[PDB]
């Protein structure tokens, strides 16, 4: 009973400007709980079940970087795309890994805004739901490696 990531992506894409923007305004991820448009968006995807909602929160907050910074295409990891941008410096990715909980989601969103990244969305999505233990390390690995091929 997983979260259909691509379905969520298209649902986000299909939102009316009022709601897409209404959610874009959120500064921190937990503030998503104050917006009705959040509840409406998440509602098909199972936010009703606890320990589905933290994931859903992170996924939406990362989409709310807006407007369409997350562009979907073995799969392409978030670390990979952050390197493929070439705009992002290693030190920032480090701060993301080292960052405490809410701050880490925030700085991540900031990175997404900066990178206009080309990922494989559901992969990054999954990675976001289990975020993150290995995942942090894993993204570091991907970033450094992709950045070093170059």
């Amino acid at each position: 009973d997983e979260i259909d990531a691509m379905a969520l992506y298209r649902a986000w894409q299909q939102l009316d400007n009022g709601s897409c923007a209404q959610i874009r305004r959120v500064s921190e991820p937990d503030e998503l709980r104050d917006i009705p448009a959040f509840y409406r968006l998440v509602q098909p995807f199972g936010w009703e079940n606890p320990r589905h909602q933290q994931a859903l929160l992170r996924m939406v907050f990362c989409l709310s970087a807006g407007k369409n910074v997350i562009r979907h295409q073995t799969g392409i990891s978030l670390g990979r795309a952050l390197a493929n941008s070439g705009r992002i410096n290693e030190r920032r990715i480090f701060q993301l890994i080292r960052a405490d909980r809410t701050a880490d989601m925030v700085q991540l969103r900031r990175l997404l805004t900066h990178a206009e990244p080309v990922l494989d969305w559901p992969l990054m999505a999954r990675m976001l739901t289990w975020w993150g233990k290995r995942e942090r390390q894993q993204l570091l690995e991907d970033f450094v490696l992709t950045t070093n091929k170059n």
Binding site: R91, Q95, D100, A103
Partner: protein
């Protein structure tokens, strides 16, 4: 009578960033279950050493280097007036255990504290031995006999006597290695802290269509507990047999700095030039740290400061009554939160507290 002097300080800084790590993040630390903002013992120590208060009241700080080439150049100037160069060079070589040939770069095992006065005295000894046609090893044997003579040179440089020296290679390995008289703890916040992030811009006067740089910086306000211990017999020893009054003098100077000195970064952009709101000093037989008062991270009521001082007093009451401590104690505070345990004598001004430590808790 009592050998340990405990210094407890509660100090509140405004938004600032007083210790960064490799990632220019604040220095986190976890206690007992919550993140606390941390200032490293090392920063505190060097802040006090390098301080103007110290320069005025203690003297010269020590010279810490790993580079022996520069060192030999310095020593060549100063003691070059006082001793022959061949003698100086040799003194450095014996103490160092490393060969001091004119070569551009000569490196010690590790970064080490040096005192010029000390080296001068060693130069005197090497002069005596060399003229007397004494062998180096024999010289070492003789110098081993009276350690204190080597330690009074410490009085000239006190930070070493406070926090100690380590040696691996020289004659220094044999004679001049010192235990720290003062043990100090990294300061931590009394309460939980989630670090704020400031988002900055560098505006380029020559590009109109944007900023030249965008960035982030971690910062926090915090109420910090600083703790420090001075072992008194140890301090007297490390100075070459100085009296309790000299010791206590150094102890108060340390109290003053411990209440007054704040690390330098990034003070020019955040300017947390804050004084201590609470300073408490107790004499004891065995050292005591009140950090456990804040194991329950203090929750803000009318700020963090007041309930923190409250927490401190209450814990100290519990500890002092539980373990039956009957040591001399005085507390000076800026806020009107009074101490529970008499006898904690209440000092209206820091200078009065300081004079009280000098008079040994009266």
């Amino acid at each position: 009578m009592s050998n340990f002097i405990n210094i407890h300080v509660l100090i509140s800084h405004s938004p600032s960033c007083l210790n960064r790590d490799d990632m220019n993040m604040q220095k986190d630390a976890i206690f007992g279950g919550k993140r606390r903002v941390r200032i490293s013992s090392q920063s505190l120590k060097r802040a006090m050493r390098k301080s103007g208060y110290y320069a005025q009241n203690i003297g010269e700080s020590s010279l810490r280097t790993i580079h022996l080439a520069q060192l030999r150049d310095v020593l060549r100037q100063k003691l070059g007036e006082r001793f022959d160069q061949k003698i100086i060079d040799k003194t450095l070589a014996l103490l160092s255990g490393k060969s001091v040939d004119e070569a551009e770069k000569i490196s010690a095992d590790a970064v080490t504290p040096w005192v010029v006065g000390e080296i001068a005295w060693f130069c005197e000894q090497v002069a005596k031995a060399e003229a007397d046609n004494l062998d180096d090893k024999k010289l070492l044997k003789v110098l081993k006999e009276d350690i204190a003579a080597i330690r009074v040179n410490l009085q000239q440089g006190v930070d070493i006597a406070l926090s100690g020296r380590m040696a691996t290679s020289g004659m220094m390995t044999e004679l001049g290695k010192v235990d720290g008289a003062m043990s100090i703890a990294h300061a931590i916040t009394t309460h939980q802290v989630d670090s704020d992030i400031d988002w900055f811009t560098a505006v380029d006067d020559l590009q109109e269509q944007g900023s030249a740089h965008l960035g982030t910086q971690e910062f926090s306000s915090g109420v910090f507990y600083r703790y420090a211990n001075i072992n008194l017999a140890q301090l007297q020893e490390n100075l070459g047999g100085a009296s309790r009054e000299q010791a206590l003098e150094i102890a108060t100077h340390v109290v003053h700095m411990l209440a007054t000195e704040v690390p330098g970064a990034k003070q020019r952009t955040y300017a947390a030039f804050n004084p201590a709101d609470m300073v408490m000093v107790n004499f004891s037989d065995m050292p005591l740290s009140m950090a456990n008062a804040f194991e329950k991270a203090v929750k803000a009521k009318d700020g963090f400061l007041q309930p923190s001082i409250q927490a401190f007093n209450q814990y100290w009451d519990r500890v002092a009554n539980g373990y039956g401590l009957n040591g001399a104690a005085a507390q000076f505070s800026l806020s009107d939160v009074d101490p529970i345990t008499a006898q904690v004598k209440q000092m209206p001004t820091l200078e009065q507290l300081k004079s009280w430590v000098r008079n040994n808790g009266e």
